[PDB]
Each structure stands twice: as structure tokens, then as C-alpha cells.
Chains A and B, each alone.
Chain A
Amino acid sequence: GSELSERIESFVETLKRGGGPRSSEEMARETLGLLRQIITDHRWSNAGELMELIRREGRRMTAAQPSETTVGNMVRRVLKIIREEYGRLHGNEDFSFHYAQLQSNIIEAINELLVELEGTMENIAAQALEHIHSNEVIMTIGFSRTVEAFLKEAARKRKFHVIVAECAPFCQGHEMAVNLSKAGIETTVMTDAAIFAVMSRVNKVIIGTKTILANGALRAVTGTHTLALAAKHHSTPLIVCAPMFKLSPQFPNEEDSFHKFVAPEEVLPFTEGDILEKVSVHCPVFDYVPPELITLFISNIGGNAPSYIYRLMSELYHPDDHVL
């Protein structure tokens, strides 16, 4: 049915134009709902033809927005699901050994994955209380709804200061701090020009992240590199509160347009005037935190050093799917 075609096309259009939906978990859930729709409304009987199909949409998607690693690695994971179920049932060539039984199993596995994907905020939130010992000064940055859920869960049984830098290109730290203080955390907004002066007085640095690569190194909302570099100069322990699907298996310099440059209007508004002729304004939104400044990923399975993250690739994505 062409309904799948129009749905996929509307999806990739929304991805190119402007984030849809906004919440990263919501985008992963939407990607999975779409991918399930492909496994109920297309022509396939083999497994190899379905892997080619999934790659033929995943290439389009991961080339639409090179910084939407969520949908990319979600397609990678459904590919891994295909590999696993086809190999367990029939079994390196993929043959059309059998039929719809495989599809029922695939739909069931995708339903399980989607259920694990929708209840991850609550997992990390229940994992908070063990980490936020009372009277900390937890320095976040930006607005990452997982970190807000983490903190306003942990502050239901303890008390701690919460510095929050705001992202200076366009301030979202403000909304995070407002949502925090509506739960009474004694939070402290500030512009992130002062991450180094007000770091010596910080106990633990709790940052979200947009995407975890396969070095452990991540790609997180801008100015978080310098926050991590300070919080390693002051050897405070970072905490990358990222669920497990914000995990692409690329590698740091194996990606061009790593960042995501947005309309330089936000950095130097058009109202400025003539001097907008001889100035190259850069508005990088995402910055590349190397893996040796991070300390402890807080994923839905528990805490993990960065040196365990590579193993997660070997347990989530197939080694021949790192090119989608």
C-alpha cells in the first residue's frame, strides 16, 4: 500500500525540515513504529530482500539528517533483530528458507524492543537515588529531559544544589532550570561562559548527550566539550545520562558534518547590518566530547565505564551494519 510510501516520505521531509517529533525517545518510538509498518505493508518473503529494503530506507534517513543518529541506529537495531531471528530459525548467505512465522517473530521482537524503549526514563530515574548523595552541587548543561527526570527523581529523597549552564547559541538551560525549580532543587541558571569559574565548587557533572559513538566519545549539545574538559581539569566525575538507543556505532572521525551548523542568524541576528558581509559566523550545535573525559554512562542496564560501550556494539549491532 502506498500509504507506507507517503508516511515514510512525510517522515523524511520532517527530518530534513525540522525535528519531528522533538523528544528523542519519541523520535525513536516513531522510527520503530514506521519500521514495523514496513514489516507489515511491503512485498518480501526472504530475509535478504528485507535487509536490502531496510537498508534502502535507512540510507535515505541517515543521509537526510546526518546528526539524527537515533533513527539511524534504530534501523541498525531492527536489522540486527532480522539477522538474529532468521539465523535462529533457519540456521553466510540469507535465503528465503521460510515465511510468515519469521514475520510474526519479527513483529514480536520489535514490540519488545519498543516497550523497553518507552520505559527508559523511569529506569534511569530509579537508578538515580544511588548516585545523588545529599548536599551535592550537580552541574548539568542544556536541557536533556532524561537528566531532568533523573534529577527531579533523585531530589525526592535528598537535597543538593544544581548548577545549570544554558546553551548560549539558543538558551534552553533556562527551561530545564525552570522545570527543576518547579520541583524545588535550589537551582542556579548561568550562561556557559562561566563553566570554569564555577566548576571548582562542583561535586558531580551530570550531562545528557545526543549520541554516544563507539569510542565512548559522544556528540552532545554544544559547549559540553568544554564543560567536560573543565570537569576533567577539576577531576570531577562525569555522568552521561543516556539511554541505550542514543548509541550509534560510528567512530569519531569516521563522520563528516559531525556537528550541525544552524542559521547563523542566532549568533549574530540579521538586524546587525553591514558588518554581516565580511564575517563567517559559525553556529555549531553539537560538539564532540572525546571518550577519556567521560567516566560513567548511566544506561538503562546500569552504570558502565566507556570501555564497556564498545562491547555494547558487539551485543546490539551487527559488525557489517556499521555502514547501514
Chain B
Amino acid sequence: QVPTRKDYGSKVSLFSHLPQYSRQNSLTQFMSIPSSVIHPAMVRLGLQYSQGLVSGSNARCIALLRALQQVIQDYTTPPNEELSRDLVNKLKPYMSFLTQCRPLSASMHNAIKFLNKEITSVGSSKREEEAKSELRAAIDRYVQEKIVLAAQAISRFAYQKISNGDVILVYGCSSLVSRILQEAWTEGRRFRVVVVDSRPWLEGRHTLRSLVHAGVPASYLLIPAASYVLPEVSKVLLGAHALLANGSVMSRVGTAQLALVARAHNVPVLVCCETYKFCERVQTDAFVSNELDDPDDLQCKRGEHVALANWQNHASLRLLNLVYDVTPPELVDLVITELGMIPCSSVPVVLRV
């Protein structure tokens, strides 16, 4: 049986439920090397999740699906045990292990839901090799349609709004917005950008590079200075690590703050996402379900001393760095998806099919 990754520090009072994991104690410490109880692709995936090597939502989903493809490839079957139920029976443990390494984000929820629905719905009347190859082809069809073609459809939808001269704003290493801006600057629309970034994971530098390598004008500034640049900003183009069942866009921990300061400066705030991330649950406030990273990465090297150098000793100092944050559906003015430029509050009525 796979162990339980032990927490690190003391979760803040309002987080007696969200675990606080560190990076140093990778769960692999208590597992064999010729990985026996689980499949080696699964432990490799969990281990490059833990060390924080696979960041974005689409990237996490793609890597997870490659892992599942591997698992299916080396799947075999116990005698007189139908593959239909048994594959899910053996895929739940790897999902719990990944949840231990780093809690399954929304994209992974949707992906594993799709794959489990597909496994349960393939008839027991198939040969091993044929069922496996069909499963792999279906996973590949998923990756092509839900997340690769969706990027093209979303770029074609978004290009009809990005006027000339307007300084679109972004946030964080969001694969879809970088793709949109590349594909809409290699079209002709001359604009600018103003990236907004957020410690402790300066995940803004990714989109900053991936943009300036493509000739786009840019500008970089940390998230607390947002309320400074917004007088000039003429759109906003956030990301979404989910869309909950009521339009409230879950994201990195700065998106709600940006949407709020944006509406307060009165600039349109058009989050763009793909139809697969739209989840089924719904949450209103930013605390019922989140993620808490290794807080020890907050400590910033100022002067000669990291100001939070020792952190555990002060029993009245408790750290947190939320990873997820919910912007409400009254600050969103657009949700661009392949199924249309749907508006904010009417995501569940129209994307639950």
C-alpha cells in the first residue's frame, strides 16, 4: 500500500482541510524502485508533479494522458476478470497517488472522468490488443479535439475582437493566451501587451518569453502594481484552470483581484478557456477547495538575509500560499470557448451538453 505524504508546517486556521505539502519529502521515499504496487509511468508522473516540473493546466492534462496511454499500453489482464470494470479498478489507485503528490486539478478531473467513462463503456467482447489500441486512439482523439483543436477555434474566435492599438493584458503562464496572442499577431493586428506576474511562482516570465520571442511588444509588472497600468489597458485576457458550474472562473491566485480592479477601472475582462475544463462542481468563495504549496518558497532574498529565514519557530506565524482563486461571474464579460463567445453567467445552461 502506497503511503500518505506527510504535511509540512501548520495550515492556517481556515484550512484544516486543505493539506500543506512540501517538495523535499517526495512520497517516493517509501516505494520500491522497480515500482511494484503502481506502474512506473504513474510514479514518474507523480514525481514530476511533486517537484513542480509540469505547470500549466493543459500541460498537466497532456502529460497525464501520455501517462495513461503508457499504462494502457502495458496493460494485461488477470484471467476471467473482465477488463471493463477492472481497468478502472486499477486506475483509481494511481489517481489517489497523483492526488497525494499534488491534488488533481480540474483538467485532470475532466480527463480521468472521460477516460473512466470510456473504459466502462467498451464491450467485454474485444481482444486485449484491440481494446488497448482502440483506447489509445480514443485518448489521442481527445487530445486532438478537446485541447489542441480548441486552441485553434478559440484563436479564431478571439482574433475578431483584438483590435489595433489596444494594450491587451494577460496573467501567468497560460498556454492558451500565449497561443492566442501569437496566432493573432502573426495575422496582422498590431497591438501591445502588459504581462502581470505574481510571486512566489513567477509564472509570468513564461508568457513574457514566449511572447517577446515572437516579436510582440510587451511590458512586465508584478500583480500589486496592476492598479497602476489599468488606465491604459483596453482589454483583459485571463486564463482558467476551471470553469465551475456557475461561471465563477477558478484560476491562479491573482485572477479575481485583476478582474475586480479591472471592473473598478472599467475595462472588459474576457477570460478564455476550452470546453473540457468546464467542471461540474461549483464553489463561491476561495476557501472550500484549493491547493497549498510548500510555503517555504515565499522567502525572498532581500539585502543579505531571507526575511522569513527561520519560519517554523514562531508559533504565532503561520504561512500559506494559496494556488487557486475564484473570480465571481459578475466580473467576467466573456468566456471564449469553441462552442462560442458565450457570456459569463450562462456557462452552465449551455455547456452542460
A touches B in complex, CB < 8 A: yes
Q: What residues on B are CB-neighbors of A184 within 8 Å?
A: none
- Which residues between 279 and 310 of chain B lie within 8 Å of chain A, taking CB atoms? 280-285, 287-289
Q: Given the known A-B contacts A307-B345, A307-B349, are A134 and B17 also in contact in the complex, defined by CB atoms under 8 Å?
A: yes
Asked if B14 and A135 sit within 8 Å, CB to CB, the answer is: yes
Partner of A307, one of B282, B284, B288, B346: B346
A105 CB to closest chain B CB, in angstroms?
27
A304→B281 contact, CB < 8 A = no
Cβ of B16 under 8 Å from chain A: yes
On whether the beta carbons of A133 and B349 are closer than 8 Å, the reply is: no
Residues of A within 8 A of B17 (CB): 133-134, 158
User: Is A88 an interface residue, CB under 8 A from the partner?
Assistant: no
Scan A286-324; emit 1 where CB is below 8 A from any B CB, else 0.
Answer: 000000000110000011110110110000000000000
Interface residue? B24 (CB, 8 A): no
Q: How far is the CB of B192 from chain A (nearest CB, A)?
A: 33
Asked whether B247 is an interface residue with its Cβ less than 8 Å from the other chain, the reply is yes
Please tell me if the beta carbons of B288 and A130 are within 8 angstroms of each other in the complex. Answer: yes
User: Which of B226-255 touch A at CB < 8 Å?
Assistant: 245-247
**A305 in contact with B284 given A134-B16, A158-B17 (CB within 8 Å):** no
Is A239 part of the binding interface, using a Cβ–Cβ cutoff of 8 Å?
Answer: yes
A310 to B348, CA, bound (A): 12
Task: Decide if B247 touches A305 in the complex (CB within 8 Å).
Answer: yes
B329 contacts across to A, CB distance below 8 A: 305
Cβ-closest chain A residue relative to B289: A130
Shortest Cβ gap from A153 to chain B (Å): 15
Task: Tell me the residues in window 128-142 of chain A with beta carbons closer than 8 Å to chain B beta carbons.
Answer: 130-131, 133-135
Could you tell me the distance between the alpha carbons of A307 and B14 in the complex, rounded to whole angstroms? 30
**Which residues of B have CB within 8 Å of A304?**
245-246, 282, 348
In the complex, the answer to whether A303 meets B245 with C-beta atoms within 8 Å is yes
Whether B13 is near chain A, meaning CB under 8 Å from some CB there, is yes
Query: A237 to B327, alpha carbons, bound, how many Å?
Result: 12
Is A203's CB within 8 Å of the partner chain B?
A: yes
* Bound Cα distance A304, B247 (Å): 10
Residue from the list B282, B285, B348 in contact with A203, Cβ < 8 A = B285
CA distance in complex: A134, B14 (Å): 6
Per-position binary interface string of chain B over residues 314-353, scored 1 when its CB falls under 8 Å from any chain A CB and 0 otherwise:
0000000000000001000000000000000110110000
Residues of A within 8 A of B288 (CB): 130-131, 133
CB proximity of A137 to chain B, nearest CB, Å: 11
B280 touches which one: A135, A296, A302 (CB < 8 A)?
A302
Distance from B215 Cβ to chain A, minimum over Cβ atoms (Å):
41
Which residues does chain B contribute within 8 Å of A135, judged by CB atoms?
13-14, 16
Q: Which residue of B lies closest to A314 (CB)?
A: B349
User: Does A204 interact with chain B (Cβ within 8 Å)?
Assistant: yes
Tell me, in angstroms, the Cα distance from A135 to B14 when the chains sit together. 6
Residues in A whose Cβ lies below 8 Å from that of B346: 307
Contact between chains at A302 and B16 (CB < 8 Å): no
Contact: A237 with B349, CB < 8 Å?
A: no
Which chain A residue shows the least CB distance to B330? A292
Instruction: Write the chain B residue with the least CB distance to A237.
Output: B284
Q: Judging by beta carbons under 8 Å apart, are B284 and A296 in contact?
A: yes
Q: Which residues of B contact A133 (CB under 8 A)?
A: 14-15, 17, 287-288
| A305 adjacent to B280 (CB under 8 Å) | no
Min Cβ gap A130→B in Å is 6
Q: A130 to B245, alpha carbons, bound, how many Å?
A: 14
Tell me the complex Cα distance, A40–B94, Å.
54
A97 to chain B, nearest CB (A): 32
Answer whether A239 and B284 are a contact pair too, CB < 8 Å, given A135-B14, A307-B345.
yes
Give the complex CA separation of A74 and B13 in angstroms. Answer: 45
The answer to whether B282 and A303 have CB atoms under 8 Å apart is: yes
Closest to A312 in B: B349
Chain B residues with CB under 8 Å of A295's CB are 246, 284
* Separation of A135 and B247 alpha carbons in the complex (Å): 26
Establish whether residues B281 and A130, one from each chain, have CB atoms under 8 Å apart when the complex forms.
Answer: yes
Once the chains bind, are A237 and B285 in contact (CB under 8 Å)?
yes
8 A Cβ contacts from B177-198 to A: none
Task: State in angstroms the CA–CA spacing of A295 and B282 once bound together.
Answer: 11
The docked-state distance in angstroms from the alpha carbon of A203 to that of B281 is: 20
A310 to chain B: closest CB distance in Å?
A: 8
Shortest CB–CB separation between residue B309 and chain A, in angstroms?
29
Cβ-closest chain B residue relative to A204? B285
Q: Considering the complex, which residues of chain A in the window 236-269 have a beta carbon less than 8 Å from any beta carbon of chain B? A: 237, 239
With both beta carbons as reference points, the residue of chain A lying nearest to B287 in the complex is identified as: A133
Q: Kindly state the separation between the CA atoms of A310 and B280 in the bound complex, as whole angstroms.
A: 18
Measured CA separation A160–B201 after assembly (Å): 32
Residues of A within 8 A of B13 (CB): 135
Please tell me if the beta carbons of A302 and B281 are within 8 angstroms of each other in the complex: yes
By the criterion CB–CB under 8 Å, are B345 and A305 in contact?
Answer: yes
A130-B288, A133-B287, A303-B246 given; A311·B282 CB < 8 A:
no
Chain B: CB-nearest residue to A160:
B14
- CB of A160 to closest CB in B, whole Å: 10
Kindly identify, within residues 149 to 172 of chain B, every residue whose CB is under 8 Å from any CB belonging to chain A.
none
Q: Is the CB of A305 within 8 A of B246?
A: yes
Name the residue in A133, A203, A239, A310 with the highest tally of chain B Cβ atoms < 10 Å from its Cβ. Answer: A133
For B246, what are the chain A residues with a Cβ–Cβ distance below 8 Å?
295-296, 303-305, 307-308
Q: How far is the CA of A204 from the CA of B14 in the complex (A)?
A: 13
Which residue of chain A has its CB nearest to the CB of B244? A303
Known: A305-B245, A307-B246. 4 other contacts (CB 8 A): A133-B287, A135-B14, A158-B17, A310-B349
Top 3 A-B residue pairs of the complex, sorted by shortest distance between their CB atoms: A305-B246, A237-B284, A303-B282
What are 19 contact pairs spanning A and B, CB under 8 A? A130-B281, A130-B289, A133-B17, A133-B287, A133-B288, A134-B14, A134-B16, A135-B13, A158-B16, A295-B246, A296-B246, A302-B280, A302-B282, A303-B282, A304-B282, A307-B349, A308-B348, A308-B349, A311-B349
Interface on A for B, CB 8 Å cutoff?
Answer: 130-131, 133-135, 158, 203-204, 237, 239, 295-296, 302-305, 307-308, 310-311
